[PDB]
């Protein structure tokens, strides 16, 4: 056996028990077959770490986070994927997951990018706060370090249910061990800047995927760390002082003058695109497409922005925190 993948055969059967069907996933840590296992009677999602040492090395970080994770008495533990078992296998390590839907990278290719309505960004918004609440135990203190469209799974096709996937890049607080983490559309900016993080970079995931679940299109879609910062300032403006002061990574981006203010190195003036008219909040809400609509008035859109520019909160000590969140005025009933 050649190469850090599992050949896998469609057709075989492992240990008399898994009736493997197809490979549906392949991603940097290896792949994820659909498999029928004959003993629980029940289709399986079954990830194949690849056999190469790092890997299997933060594969067994993700079985112990989902082991520690699974095993909570709380109903809030049902956001999270479930890890039925794991096992050894030709050399690979495998870990067995109920089966999901697709994701909501794929639910907003289905509207055409157009995006969907704030109803159901509301329901997203609701359960992912109620996820990370969760993560927040502290027993737990969990930081997922990826969450994107692609990790956020639909239970069923034709119902509003999400869970998250994939902790293969998650740490316990105080146990960094990444300097280089999330996904560069949805990294925080603590983490662009190369300080210490903690549960508060998930939070700034989430509220780039809310945004970009209603518009269709990513909030800060960098091409490289530098084009990424640049288009977080056009939105927010330069960070404070007393954060760059102290970030390692400040004068990739940013350069101190005399003063002892900060400007950008070597794009909209910072702060001058306004999340305001990203949601055209009063020009008809996404590429104008929910004028009129219910469920879409100004009203409605201020709400929202709101709740997003408390999760954009550069400071990560005052970021708005998953009780807080779920709290927001934007999920009263
Ligand atoms: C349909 C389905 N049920 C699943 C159940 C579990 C998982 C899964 C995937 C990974 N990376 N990490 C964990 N902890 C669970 N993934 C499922 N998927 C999507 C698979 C096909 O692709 C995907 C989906 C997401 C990421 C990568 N590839």
Redesign the pocket.
Known sequence: PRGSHMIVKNGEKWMDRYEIDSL??K?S?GQ?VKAYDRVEQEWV?I?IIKNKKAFLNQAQI?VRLLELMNKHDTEMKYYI?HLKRHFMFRNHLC?V???????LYDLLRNTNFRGVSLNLTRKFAQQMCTALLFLATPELSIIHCDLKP??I?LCNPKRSAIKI????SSCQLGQRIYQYIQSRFYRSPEVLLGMPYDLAIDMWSLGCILVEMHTGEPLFSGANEVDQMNKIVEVLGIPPAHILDQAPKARKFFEKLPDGTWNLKKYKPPGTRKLHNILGVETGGPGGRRAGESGHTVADYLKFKDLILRMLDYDPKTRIQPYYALQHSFFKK
């Open positions: 549906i996933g991603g840590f994820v999602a990830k993700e994927v870990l997951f109920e089966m999901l839907s697709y994701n692609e990790n799974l996937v994939d902790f293969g």
